[PDB]
Copies of this chain bind each other. A is one copy, B any other.
Amino acid sequence: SGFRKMAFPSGKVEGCMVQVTCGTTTLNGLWLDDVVYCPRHVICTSEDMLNPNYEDLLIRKSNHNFLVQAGNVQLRVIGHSMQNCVLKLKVDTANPKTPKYKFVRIQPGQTFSVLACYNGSPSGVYQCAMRPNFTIKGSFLNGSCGSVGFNIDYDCVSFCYMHHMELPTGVHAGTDLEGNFYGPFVDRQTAQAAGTDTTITVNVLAWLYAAVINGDRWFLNRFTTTLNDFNLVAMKYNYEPLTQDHVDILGPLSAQTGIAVLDMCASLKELLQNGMNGRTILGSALLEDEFTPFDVVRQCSGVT
């Protein structure tokens, strides 16, 4: 028992982390096969970060300008291209440590592990979620650009996020591995509206199933609700509306505890309207929405 904000093991992703320097700017790159993926803002100095013309800035650069270092060894760049907001630097060597990998675009509300990196060297791994408004609440500093978010299905690493920007609001913005920004963000030094964020209702419900599994049952009540009534409450408390698909996804956790999904919604409804009353659920004094139903089943079952 016990419930931790567990991240996937980062070894497979550490073997791919390289440093990419371009001019005075240094950041992280991801080396898989004979290619190094990194944010395109590596070609920018501080002045032109206000409104950069990346097509124009990339034209004054040639393969010899992209200094890629895999730890201490220099990688020979034999090709370069811009795909959306990432630069693809083809290197003459394929990463001997390339794991089985996929590039996937996750849905808002999905979770992943992030391996923070500075100068192509890792510092830590933390589990986090893609907010409903496509931002991430990461822990990132200058030079963490190029740090990736990922998932691991047994041996395959599904790379879902490359880190790019820190919004003036302290939250982070990034892209999928094809250079597509999650959310409305652009790679410019301009204040950007992240939009209204909500609470991922299905994940909160999943975390309530993980509490019952792990002994915390105080919030369980003798009530039930409908999806209609629940959503009236969920809108007021700025929670994502619960759909029938969410209920079906919660099927396995509902079968493990024997607590119907609308019965769990009644517990959530009461907690939303009354608060925790100074009590904690899984050592937390707030409703946690960063554990999807798959994470709860995986952690409470033991998927390696």
Complex Cα distance, B275 from A14, in Å, reads 41
Stretch at the interface among A36-44, A45-53, A263-271, A276-284: A276-284
Residues on B with C-beta less than 8 A from A139 are: 1-4, 6, 299
Flag if A126 contacts B285 (CB, 8 Å). no
Copies in the complex: 2
CA distance A276 to B276 in the complex (A): 12
Q: Which of B7, B172, B275 contacts A126 (CB 8 A)?
A: B7
A298 CA to B302 CA, complexed, in Å: 31
In the assembled complex, which residues on chain B have CB atoms less than 8 Å from the CB atom of A14? 9, 11
* Residues of B with C-beta under 8 A to A142: 302
9 contacts between A and B (CB under 8 A): A1-B140, A1-B166, A2-B138, A2-B139, A7-B7, A9-B11, A10-B11, A126-B127, A142-B302
Chain B residue contacts of A73, Cβ below 8 A: none
Whole-angstrom CA separation of A298 from B5 in the bound complex: 20
Given A5-B5, A11-B15, A123-B303, 4 extra CB contacts under 8 A: A4-B128, A117-B304, A142-B302, A285-B286
